[PDB]
Design a protein around this ligand. Sequence first.
Ligand SMILES: NC(=O)c1ccc[n+]([C@@H]2O[C@H](COP(=O)([O-])OP(=O)(O)OC[C@H]3O[C@@H](n4cnc5c(N)ncnc54)[C@H](O)[C@@H]3O)[C@@H](O)[C@H]2O)c1
Ligand SMILES: NC(=O)c1ccc[n+]([C@@H]2O[C@H](COP(=O)([O-])OP(=O)(O)OC[C@H]3O[C@@H](n4cnc5c(N)ncnc54)[C@H](O)[C@@H]3O)[C@@H](O)[C@H]2O)c1
Ligand SMILES: NC(=O)c1ccc[n+]([C@@H]2O[C@H](COP(=O)([O-])OP(=O)(O)OC[C@H]3O[C@@H](n4cnc5c(N)ncnc54)[C@H](O)[C@@H]3O)[C@@H](O)[C@H]2O)c1
Ligand SMILES: NC(=O)c1ccc[n+]([C@@H]2O[C@H](COP(=O)([O-])OP(=O)(O)OC[C@H]3O[C@@H](n4cnc5c(N)ncnc54)[C@H](O)[C@@H]3O)[C@@H](O)[C@H]2O)c1
Lengths: 338, 338, 338, 338
Amino acid sequence: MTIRVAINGFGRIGRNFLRCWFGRQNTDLEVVAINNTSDARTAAHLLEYDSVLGRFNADISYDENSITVNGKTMKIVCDRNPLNLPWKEWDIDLVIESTGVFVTAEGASKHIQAGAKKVLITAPGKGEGVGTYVIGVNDSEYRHEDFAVISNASCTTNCLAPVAKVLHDNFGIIKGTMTTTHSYTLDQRILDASHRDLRRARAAAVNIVPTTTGAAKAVALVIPELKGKLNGIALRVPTPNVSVVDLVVQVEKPTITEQVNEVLQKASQTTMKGIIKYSDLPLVSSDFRGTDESSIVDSSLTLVMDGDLVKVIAWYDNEWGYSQRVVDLAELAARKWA
Amino acid sequence: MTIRVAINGFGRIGRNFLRCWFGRQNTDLEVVAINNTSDARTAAHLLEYDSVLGRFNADISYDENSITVNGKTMKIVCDRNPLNLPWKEWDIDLVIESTGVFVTAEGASKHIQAGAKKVLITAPGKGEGVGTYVIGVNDSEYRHEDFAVISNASCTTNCLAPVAKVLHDNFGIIKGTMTTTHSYTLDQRILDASHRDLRRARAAAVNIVPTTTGAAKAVALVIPELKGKLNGIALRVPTPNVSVVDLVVQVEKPTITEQVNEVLQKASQTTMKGIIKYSDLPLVSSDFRGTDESSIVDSSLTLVMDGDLVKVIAWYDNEWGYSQRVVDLAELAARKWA
Amino acid sequence: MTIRVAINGFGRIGRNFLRCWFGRQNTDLEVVAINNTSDARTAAHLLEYDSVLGRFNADISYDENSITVNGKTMKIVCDRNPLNLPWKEWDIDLVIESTGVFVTAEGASKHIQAGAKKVLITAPGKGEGVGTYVIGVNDSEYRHEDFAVISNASCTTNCLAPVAKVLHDNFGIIKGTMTTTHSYTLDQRILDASHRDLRRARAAAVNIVPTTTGAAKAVALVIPELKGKLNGIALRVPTPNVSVVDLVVQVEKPTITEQVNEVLQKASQTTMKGIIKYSDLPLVSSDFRGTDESSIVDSSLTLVMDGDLVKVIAWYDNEWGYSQRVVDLAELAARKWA
Amino acid sequence: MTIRVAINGFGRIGRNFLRCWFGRQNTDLEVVAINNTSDARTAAHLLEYDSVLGRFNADISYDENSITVNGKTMKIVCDRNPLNLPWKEWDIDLVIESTGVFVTAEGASKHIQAGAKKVLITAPGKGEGVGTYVIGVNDSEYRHEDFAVISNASCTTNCLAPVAKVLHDNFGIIKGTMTTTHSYTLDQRILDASHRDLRRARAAAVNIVPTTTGAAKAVALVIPELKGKLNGIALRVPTPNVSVVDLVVQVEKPTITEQVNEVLQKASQTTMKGIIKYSDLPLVSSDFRGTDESSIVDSSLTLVMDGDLVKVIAWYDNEWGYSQRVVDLAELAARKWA
Ligand SMILES: NC(=O)c1ccc[n+]([C@@H]2O[C@H](COP(=O)([O-])OP(=O)(O)OC[C@H]3O[C@@H](n4cnc5c(N)ncnc54)[C@H](O)[C@@H]3O)[C@@H](O)[C@H]2O)c1
Ligand SMILES: NC(=O)c1ccc[n+]([C@@H]2O[C@H](COP(=O)([O-])OP(=O)(O)OC[C@H]3O[C@@H](n4cnc5c(N)ncnc54)[C@H](O)[C@@H]3O)[C@@H](O)[C@H]2O)c1
Ligand SMILES: NC(=O)c1ccc[n+]([C@@H]2O[C@H](COP(=O)([O-])OP(=O)(O)OC[C@H]3O[C@@H](n4cnc5c(N)ncnc54)[C@H](O)[C@@H]3O)[C@@H](O)[C@H]2O)c1
Ligand SMILES: NC(=O)c1ccc[n+]([C@@H]2O[C@H](COP(=O)([O-])OP(=O)(O)OC[C@H]3O[C@@H](n4cnc5c(N)ncnc54)[C@H](O)[C@@H]3O)[C@@H](O)[C@H]2O)c1
């Protein structure tokens, strides 16, 4: 039956996930609690009024201890430390980890000590003992008992992995390389300020800033055949949302642009319905705000050099599209709860 | 004497201050130490490379706990707790407090408890007990013994006060209002994220964002005759540096556009040289990047409606100009030192 | 009965007007033709996909000579010269002038020679013989026979005029002054390039650029009692949409903040329903995208100095809100057609 | 000889060219006239004040039909039709064509018909019959008599060619792909507005915008061995200056990251001094503002996947660096002049 759910850290991903879930047709989820480093006041307001999502059209209320949306009432808490959270008493089955701060098996597992059964990191996990899934790529390989702490990977990996999969299943990937042109995030600085990354230290809205990305390697986690076959880098540009992957692969079967486009389109219609969108129209970044899929292939941008060096460009709503997938993963965890 | 100076917090203001100070002709200041949350490497890199100021043209080098600029070595410490600092042992006369977090008389006097004799908050003072000075406005009221904790006020006030002084001295301000169209700062949030000001909580580079400002009440600290006579609001817009003040005052002696521009000009050549720049060219914000002055009167924007309702638009480089003034205020304390 | 309508110049205003009209509950208008300096291809695509409005959710088709939206078929033409347009044969009653280029009584009147009965400039008119209306302020004063060429003023004047009216009717305006902080427009340059205005010549997205505005004077056109009582200036900032008016007036009846807020709210509920919105929530510029009203008063920003110097700040969607008014004016022209 | 030069079109490239030329050590060029759509006033103002370059530090003065810089007077004309120009009577050897509209052999030869002996398009050549040179790449193939109309190619090609040359000379390029993340330019539209490229039709400072580029085919004009071996796409992002090229080539001799960085470095010290800058610091885009070089290799971004799939990231100041190269190309034509 249904599983009870709480959110941890009500930021971009956290509020996106909610609105994604509130838009859902059907569900096996019951959101019931939210924990964030701010009062309920600042919660129910960043929810309704979003610089990027536009205004959430829904009945929204709040008091000191709760917030409420379209009938449904949640519960608000405020513990910087998950070990202190009322998950046992509140019979919390799954916690969505969206603080960005508890991404190790241990930290994410503090929610387990506190009474929760399973935790879903909305971000790559670090260290050992987290199970990583990307919907459309990996999720047939899901067993409730494998991991109490799971990861939905990164927004970038979710864009990249489904395209890698299709390209691989159809032409065989030998090796390749990838660049992501990414809208800045909160991990960057609006002005030159201290950061562990001497580049992310620098004013985000007036720079192209190069940075590292684990995403090309991460595909290995969900497509182990591509282990050591992909590298990459990211470039932060001053957009606030939507991002793009530029993937170049040496492929085993010689092909043409029309054909790799054909197979990507096929997938968008079939094995990848809902995950890959196929765009043949001459569009730009803002046109994909609020798109549900995880990779949006720009077919007119696909390229093939001498039969076997292919390039495809895929867009993604790095916040919203990713949040539809974390929803999906949660629904899957629900349906498969052993 | 020649006084020994420590910089607490090596951010925008902190680094501008060092850059301004190295480019000075003569000085009664010796900068001996710097405390900042990062390491000496991160500090020297952020010092040499600046997105707004461009490259620092100097000989810069660093080891594990010092940076050296043009022969002058300065010790680096990393201590979030000002009570810990070895100011007594390093014979520190003046601490420049530019962390933005010790802005009360008590917070900032942590530096005095640790051995310093005077501290200069590079921001307005919070609460009672700090002494505030705006070079060109009330610096003649500076007395060594008055306060252990002193303030250079805000960039906005430093832009407002000089213009207000000249306007009031020549026509008599009765009451007035001001709006500041301000580049975003590090106190503003990168993307939609929590903040005590729900408006400051929103993505700074995609929003015009209204916030309160103390700047207009503050001018009374330095021009007491204006007490109770000015209020203002601020609107944060997506540029990374240089702001503008839009001042509307009702005035005692009726006047004309030609005449107020005339007095503002006269001032810029005499009583306010170096403090008020007088610009009669059709310029825009970026042209004032690097301007040493505090206020830059845009002369062709001056309006006088029906004799006694005057509007003056004045730009300011909100980091660089302001930082030249903190230098000035530090030099001043040095010369009046007892 | 209904009047037949054509649009001239399918840019921001032109496409906004259409979508506004397509969202309308009821109507006395029948759009039937569109004339723009580009094929129908580029027309039906800039319509559906908008960087600012988001995607137009509606059934949209096009061939070489037409475009079609939700059943309704229009007709596409392409004459840089209105004298060549098929208005006579197409029995065109009203033309919406949105090219920005035919804003004199003569030029706008070329549409008359070509067979149209009335023309509505979506912009201030210049020279003599255009009748200017701002809904909520002036429109009771509308007579079909006064002008064959009418003007809906500017987006800025529409924000300013209703607030001036209410403030005047309640407290008596003596004189005042206004600044608009405006999202850049197509009349600006993305980079430093030649322009009749030496300031609008300069890179719009990385400058605060001062420019002139006729808006404060224009209020005189629709509130002749305020003739010579208002001046102002504009400041272009790098946002793409939403703008703000900052209005400061010396008022005759001494009042308080609560009260001027009270009267503005009253108006938003009554004589100004649909034109003035009253916002008491702590919001930012992006939150008013797609708002229908012409002035959005930010009550928490209202100020009163010594009883009789009042400041109110009003937001506006400079494209969308203005386009709801041009629709309104057109509906009025229809209903009053003598 | 020492040659007489006219500048047709005083825009970004036009003005950079003059600024670059005045800051040159020695010159075989004499600039005698300038043709631009505006007046002499607008030209001198745009020359002194530049949003990207900041203030031109020179003695600048102007009358109705001349500007004077550091003693050197240059005549101003305003003639949209190159056939009209008095190049024969002013004994004009070399016309710098930087209007962006006479880019075919025939369009540009209008200047030859009007009396000039050679024209240099500051952009790629459209169609057959123009000669193309990239300083540092094939300038040794420059022969006075080969073409009346010559080209400096695009900023992107000027960044790509040098890197391509060194990569190919040392490892042997087989085939490859490139993407250019480019600051927006004046060919890009301010807000959503009509254009032949529906993607270039969209607001440049709020969109990542994909457009085609000839840059990768073009490198073959200057490195013929690369004919048919490179393709590319461009992505326009919201910065006003400095771009970056992301180059992926499959290579004949297997190699390692250390070694390609080694050869790129060696080059930057020897065979490509002044053309390729070698940056091993963790920098960002703004740090390359004002860089004289053509390509700036970001050494820590270099990737080599599995021996023969190399990626190099290289920045360029797309206006300033490129304009130093048009100077170079003009000096070159001057020295080889017959
Ligand atoms: N932004 C994207 O596009 C994107 C895409 C994929 C994954 N992610 C990942 O999602 C995670 C969240 O990133 P974000 O972009 O939403 O930034 P965010 O600022 O929105 O972080 C979300 C929230 O966590 C809250 N929080 C912090 N510490 C907390 C604590 N101790 N207890 C409870 N709440 C706490 C913060 O106050 C914030 O509201 C990150 O790990 C990021 O890597 C982000
Ligand atoms: N930016 C402007 O235009 C402007 C103008 C005038 C005044 N100010 C004032 O300058 C002050 C600094 O603002 P900023 O713009 O320079 O932001 P900032 O970049 O300087 O951030 C402040 C610095 O202090 C450091 N720091 C934080 N906590 C510390 C601690 N406990 N101990 C030691 N160091 C610590 C931070 O790591 C950073 O280096 C603020 O109070 C602001 O109001 C700013
Ligand atoms: N942008 C605003 O916020 C705003 C607000 C109020 C009023 N206005 C006014 O609206 C008018 C249009 O401005 P805009 O912002 O929509 O710019 P715009 O670029 O969208 O101009 C609209 C269209 O007119 C077309 N056009 C040009 N010449 C033509 C011709 N000879 N025949 C037919 N079509 C032609 C252009 O191709 C463009 O598509 C201007 O006069 C402006 O002052 C604009
Ligand atoms: N911006 C870059 O990074 C870059 C780099 C390399 C090459 N280019 C090339 O430089 C050329 C100019 O582009 P830009 O960026 O300098 O835009 P721009 O600012 O220079 O606009 C071009 C100039 O030419 C003038 N002009 C237009 N028509 C004219 C005519 N008929 N006669 C005389 N003058 C006329 C315009 O008024 C303006 O002064 C383009 O062809 C572009 O492809 C640009």
